[PDB]
Amino acid sequence: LKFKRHKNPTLGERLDNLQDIKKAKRVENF
Amino acid sequence: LKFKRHKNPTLGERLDNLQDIKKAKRVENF
Amino acid sequence: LYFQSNAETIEIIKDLFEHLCGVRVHRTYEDDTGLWFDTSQGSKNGIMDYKLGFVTEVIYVPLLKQRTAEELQELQKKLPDYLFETLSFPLRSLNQFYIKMSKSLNKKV
Amino acid sequence: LYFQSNAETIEIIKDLFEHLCGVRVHRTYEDDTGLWFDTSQGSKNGIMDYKLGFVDTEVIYVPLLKQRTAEELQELQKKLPDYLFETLSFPLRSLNQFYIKMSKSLNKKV
């Protein structure tokens, strides 16, 4: 398969960010 | 040895560009 | 005789890094949490949408809404488990992150 | 709420790509020849300065050695392939292959 290229702040976005911080699993190296 | 990070248009610059075009060896792949 | 506006430059720098590095930053903003980048990285082989936050702590949030069901299937065999998770890591490791993504998108499957 | 000037955004986008990709664009201008980027890519292991031009689009690549020390050259010279010291012209689509070649070649132990 070849992926297709896709063509080119709300309160919801702000809130979603806060949850994403809380959810995030800390990792220090890849 | 570790390289040190360095800290952050003239007529000559324009001209040097023209030279650089002319010298440059076309290549198609790496 | 060749004036570039601040706006026009952002587009020129954006254009460069897509061809150069396989990265495309659509949007940037600051809120109270930190600094956020809406991002698609990849090629024809594999595209990953994700969100990058800086708080220095880095937050990585994978964005799967735009991927097709197929593309997910290709992705799910391409990407490692942790790349589907929401992560937090030091800044210094961000380029190691970039490299893992690029390698993991390129891997045949 | 938070407001970013067009200027401020450029600095943020730059700052990101340095940490993300090991690339730092210091300057851009257009002239009659094309569109030109003054550029440094690498890490602690190896830094390479160079100039990028865009002119079907051709890329012109010009190594810039004035800022490197004599040592750094010695390390670089054993690190980089011959063609990467030369001034090149290649098609746009090969640019990411170029970027990868550069970053690998800098990283290589020597």
TrEMBL record, chains A, B:
Top-level taxon: Eukaryota
Protein name: Dsn1p
Source organism of the structure: Saccharomyces cerevisiae (Baker's yeast)
Full-protein positions shown: 72 to 107 of 573
Automatic annotation (TrEMBL), chain C:
Monopolin complex subunit Csm1/Pcs1 C-terminal domain ranges (all copies): 12-91
Record-level GO cellular component terms: chromosome, centromeric core domain; mitotic spindle; monopolin complex; nuclear envelope; nucleolus
One MF term in the entry's GO annotations: identical protein binding
GO biological processes: attachment of mitotic spindle microtubules to kinetochore; meiotic sister chromatid cohesion, centromeric; meiotic sister chromatid segregation; protein localization to nucleolar rDNA repeats; rDNA chromatin condensation; spindle attachment to meiosis I kinetochore
Name of the protein in question: Monopolin complex subunit CSM1
Organism for this UniProt entry: Candida glabrata
Origin organism lineage: Eukaryota, Fungi, Dikarya, Ascomycota, Saccharomycotina
Shown residues within the full chain: 69 to 181 of 181
